[PDB]
Amino acid sequence: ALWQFRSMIKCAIPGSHPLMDFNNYGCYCGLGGSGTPVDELDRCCETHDNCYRDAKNLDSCKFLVDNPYTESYSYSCSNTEITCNSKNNACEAFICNCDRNAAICFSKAPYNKEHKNLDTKKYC
Numbered sequence: 001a002l003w004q005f006r007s008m009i010k011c012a013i014p015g016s017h018p019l020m021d022f023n024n025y026g027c028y029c030g031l032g033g034s035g036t037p038v039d040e041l042d043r044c045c046e047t048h049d050n051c052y053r054d055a056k057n058l059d060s061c062k063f064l065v066d067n068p069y070t071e072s073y074s075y076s077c078s079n080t081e082i083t084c085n086s087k088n089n090a091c092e093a094f095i096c097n098c099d100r101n102a103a104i105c106f107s108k109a110p111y112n113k114e115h116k117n118l119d120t121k122k123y124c
């Protein structure tokens with residue numbers, strides 16, 4: 001679920017700001033997306049969006065109001081290591097994996113302050 005993704009991210013990135021409140025970034029980090037990702041971090045978000053897009057196409061899964069973000073799962077965090085619980089059902093596991101891949105991806109990408117709150121209407 002969305003609130004778990006936020007924690008999972010703070011797990012992969014211990015950081016120095018807990019609920020620092022995430023702002024939109026680039027062309028895909030945020031609700032929706034359009035055009036082409038502008039950088040590494042943005043690509044991480046596009047991949048995530050595409051993973052959720054795949055989720056919506058699972059013949060065996062149908063989420064509340066068709067939003068994968070509503071699907072709660074179970075995961076654990078260690079020294080920045082993320083592990084999706086094997087007891088998650090198939091639909092939950094697919095979502096947990098999308099989130100885990102993204103958290104790791106985010107933790108490796110540079111943060112270009114010039115892309116924060118980008119004017120998506122013109123550059124995306």
Ligand SMILES: C[C@H](CCC(=O)NCCS(=O)(=O)O)[C@H]1CC[C@H]2[C@@H]3[C@H](O)C[C@@H]4C[C@H](O)CC[C@]4(C)[C@H]3CC[C@]12C
Nearest residue numbers: 005006009022023024025029030031045106111113116
């Ligand atoms: C982990 C990433 C970096 C955080 C960061 O270093 N911010 C520093 C800002 S500043 O330089 O201090 O201004 C941030 C960049 C944009 C963030 C995303 C956007 O805020 C959009 C989404 C917001 C939702 O609450 C959580 C998922 C959601 C999809 C966020 C995942 C975390 C992202 C991908």
Ligand SMILES: [Ca+2]
Nearest residue numbers: 028030032033
């Ligand atoms: Ca998005």
Ligand SMILES: [Ca+2]
Nearest residue numbers: 061062063064
């Ligand atoms: Ca269902």
Ligand SMILES: [Ca+2]
Nearest residue numbers: 071072073092
């Ligand atoms: Ca669930």
Ligand SMILES: [Cl-]
Nearest residue numbers: 029030031032
């Ligand atoms: Cl989002």
Ligand SMILES: [Cl-]
Nearest residue numbers: 030031032033
């Ligand atoms: Cl958007």
Ligand SMILES: [Cl-]
Nearest residue numbers: 062063064091
């Ligand atoms: Cl369901």
Ligand SMILES: [Cl-]
Nearest residue numbers: 062063064065
């Ligand atoms: Cl349903």
